[PDB]
Design a protein around this ligand. Structure first.
Ligand SMILES: O=P(O)(O)C(O)(Cc1cccnc1)P(=O)(O)O
Ligand SMILES: O=P(O)(O)C(O)(Cc1cccnc1)P(=O)(O)O
Ligand SMILES: [Mg+2]
Ligand SMILES: [Mg+2]
Ligand SMILES: [Mg+2]
Ligand SMILES: [Mg+2]
Ligand SMILES: [Mg+2]
Ligand SMILES: [Mg+2]
Lengths: 334, 334
């Protein structure tokens, strides 16, 4: 299934590049931005649009063109992600992503990658218009993408407000605060977004149904960012494909929050003295305080308990949607 | 008229900030981003929406609420501009704007201002939904803002492709190329955008009419960027409110294009040896080559000839719109 999704990408780059004449060099650059930046991940968020589309729509309405609209809106979720990651990797001062150097760390790109990210966002709406203009769900999708863009930028704002360069923020790191950040920066666009899109494509616009689906899916995304945080420090970088910067970027990590509520006063000071600084030996002290506190073990328990809780929420809130929508998702993330 | 437009801004910040609870600090930050970044200019682009609204709509349909929608869509054109300038001042490595330091040069903002610009763009569509959701022109406006965002990002792309840091690009500087850049990066969102918005608000959706209005307005914006370029080097910075970076940023300026087509071979080499470098004495040599070539005089003639040409285009293409729409605009820019 991921094979057929990735092959559809060559067509979306054809249509996105078919505007060629005076703007020839800019189209080319956009091509190059698309290939470097949308390709290379797992495609879970975009495939999710398509998988749930097939589960929610009557197979007698799965026209070859309605299927193509589904492939395209899935790619739109991947361009959103790609827009946010490019910018995010500047702001976080990250080195690699998806096994290559962050695009803006490329000789000859640098801060021009701010335009480039902006262009990736613009492509969403060019795609929606080319494919979904005359569909009844056109405006609902535009509005969903825009709203999930806003929520994600609110989350980024808190993410950064909470993590100033060169400033001990330890007291700012609460669970309350952690949950607010990940709710907005991650849960909306990675989980609620692609399910909600498929739903509007299937003519399920009921407000209580999106709410119920959102109840489940926001908690899934909350787990997924907890996982992202854990793996920033403890993930095999030949697997994750990205070098981690949380500690040096002085971030409100699940890890630090959990550390802070188990640390002795002496341990608090090790963190105070060592967190949020670019010196490897400083980063190493924190990682070792985390390992001494048995945080990989705590993560593993939390992963078990969150899973049980998410499945209980599917029991409560999935109907009248097929549970398989939410269960295939949970399979993929846990 | 600019007084009543600027006073409406306090209400748009109220509504934009009325989402307050967990996201309290992010709303606050957004407030601060709005005030620093949307306030402080001349407001010509946003007022234009409102002025043309009053000229295009039947006064018996200028409800107090339809007038409020007009004020709000004008502010939406100013948030677009503000989104683009913030990012632009990073990418151009500018120092000041509107008489204060570029926002991202502010202690404690830096590259976080990438999120901030993104948030400013998102506010357009939050405003359109709060005020224009149930209007017949809702989707036409969303689509116009999005499309003018794309075109502007295509223009930025060429602007930068054409001006690499530390690389003699002289041969790349043509008129053909100059015109393509300013067409996209400036003409669409500063001139066609606000007139077209007012037009859709007045229920003038005719395709040939937008084309005709666009014929006039794209050339006005082409002049306006030529003016912007001239003033980057020759403008009183107590008036312009911004320090110029064109030469050091190795940019395809109207000035350089014009220089390059009048320079002697020896003069070409002065430019080759001196353009696109951060050394003040280097910048000074170029400025003096421009003054020796009598470019302020050439600009002044071009300003006269472009004006005559724009007014001839108004003769041809304004009908059935009131010429006053286009004439008030020309007054403001020349
Ligand atoms: O991929 P990354 O940088 O680990 C991340 O997940 C990317 C990201 C970007 C925007 C919203 N949410 C997550 P972050 O929170 O920055 O750690
Ligand atoms: O205000 P600036 O930087 O003079 C400018 O006009 C700003 C700008 C931003 C985006 C599109 N067009 C103009 P630029 O072309 O960068 O010189
Ligand atoms: Mg990041
Ligand atoms: Mg981040
Ligand atoms: Mg991370
Ligand atoms: Mg600039
Ligand atoms: Mg610029
Ligand atoms: Mg300029």
């Amino acid at each position: 299934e991921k094979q057929d999704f990735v092959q559809h990408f060559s067509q979306i780059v054809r249509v996105l590049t078919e505007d060629e004449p005076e703007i020839g060099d800019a189209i080319a650059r956009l091509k190059e931005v698309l290939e470097y930046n949308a390709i290379g991940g797992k495609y879970n968020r975009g495939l999710t649009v398509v998988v749930a589309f097939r589960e929610l729509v009557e197979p007698r309405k799965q026209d070859a063109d309605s299927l193509q609209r589904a492939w395209t809106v899935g790619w739109c979720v991947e361009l959103l992600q790609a827009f946010f990651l490019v910018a995010d990797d500047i702001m976080d001062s990250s080195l690699t992503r998806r096994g290559q150097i962050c695009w803006y760390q490329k000789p000859g790109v640098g801060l021009d990658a701010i335009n480039d990210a902006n262009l990736l966002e613009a492509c969403i709406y060019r795609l929606l218009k080319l494919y979904c203009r005359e569909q009844p769900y056109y405006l609902n999708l535009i509005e969903l993408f825009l709203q999930s863009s806003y929520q994600t930028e609110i989350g980024q704002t808190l993410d950064l407000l909470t993590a100033p360069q060169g400033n001990v923020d330890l007291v700012r790191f609460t669970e309350k605060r952690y949950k607010s950040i990940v709710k907005y920066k991650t849960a909306f666009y990675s989980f609620y977004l692609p399910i909600a899109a498929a739903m509007y494509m299937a003519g399920i616009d009921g407000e209580k149904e999106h709410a119920n689906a959102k109840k489940i899916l926001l908690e899934m995304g909350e787990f997924f960012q907890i996982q992202d945080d854990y793996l920033d420090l403890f993930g095999d970088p030949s697997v994750t494909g990205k070098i981690g910067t949380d500690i040096q970027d002085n971030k409100c990590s699940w890890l630090v929050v959990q550390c802070l509520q188990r640390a002795t006063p002496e341990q608090y000071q090790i963190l105070k003295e060592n967190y949020g600084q670019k010196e490897a030996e400083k980063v190493a002290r924190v990682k070792a305080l985390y390992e001494e506190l048995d945080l990989p073990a705590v993560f593993l328990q939390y992963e078990e308990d969150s899973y049980s809780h998410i499945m209980a929420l599917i029991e409560q809130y999935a109907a009248p949607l097929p549970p398989a929508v939410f269960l295939g998702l949970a399979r993929k993330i846990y």
